[PDB]
């Protein structure tokens, strides 16, 4: 079982403070983008569904990074899915 929820993160000039894995055409085929590390609300294993207005379904890891780079500085609304 899994919950979808909405959280707010701060976009700083470097990024959002986490690394993603998975995505389209990743290791085990097409998988969701999930957080695998917080560089120090979100936690490891969270699946990213939407970053601001951009849906993450079907994106590669690199495409997702370009989505993060384009985000204006300040608060950013993000939709995630989290297990149990």
């Amino acid at each position, epitope marked *: 079982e899994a919950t979808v929820c909405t959280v707010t993160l701060e976009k*700083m*000039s*470097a*990024g*959002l*403070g*986490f*690394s*993603l*894995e998975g*995505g389209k*055409g*990743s*290791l085990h085929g097409d998988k969701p983008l999930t957080i695998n590390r917080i*560089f*120090k609300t979100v936690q490891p294993g969270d699946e990213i569904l939407q970053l601001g207005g951009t849906a993450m379904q079907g994106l*590669t*890891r*690199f495409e997702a*990074w370009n989505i*993060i780079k384009a985000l204006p500085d300040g608060p950013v609304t993000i939709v995630i899915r989290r297990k149990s």
Partner: antibody
Amino acid sequence: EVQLQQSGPELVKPGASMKISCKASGYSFTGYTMNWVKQSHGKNLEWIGLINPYNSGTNYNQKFKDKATLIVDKSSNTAYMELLSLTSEDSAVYYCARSDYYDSTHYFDYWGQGTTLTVSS
Amino acid sequence: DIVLTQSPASLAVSLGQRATISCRASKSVSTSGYSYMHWYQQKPGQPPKLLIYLASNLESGVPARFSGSGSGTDFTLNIHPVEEEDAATYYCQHSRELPYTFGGGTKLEIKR
């Protein structure tokens, strides 16, 4: 899980060129940047450059701009570094190492086993 | 280019004691809430192994006796309590800006 397997040691004549390969397994090759590092007995550890296999975009250390060329092959999950007009100064152990460009963090969390190059006649 | 200077060049430390290694950068490697400074361990015949990333974070699988701290231009790697297998050369590396560079290394001898 993650493995970076480099090609074998090589003896090469001055003025020639040579290619070192780094075959990646256990992760998404086109998801992470590949770095190359030189370890010698003169300057010890030096960063040469990196390449993003997704689009072959690269950044070089300027000291190596005329010495090294980076390419990738997506179909074989392999990164290559070509070293040009070799001198004995190029004799060293070379490493490939994975980094993450997310938040521009670029630490080198996985390394190849190293490739020993000797330039000599 | 940023120059990293490690101190000391070598040190010896008894089992169970504390090893302290410092790295000094020629200019700041902190920005946007990060310190782009990382630590590696290297034993002969092997590539460097990542110990600490972004100044103070423990790489997964690295024993808790390793820690790092600092910001700006001054960083320190600490090992406590030191064990036999920590005999190695330790390196710092920045990723603040191009080109990435490494310190000169510090060799750690275990006394017995």
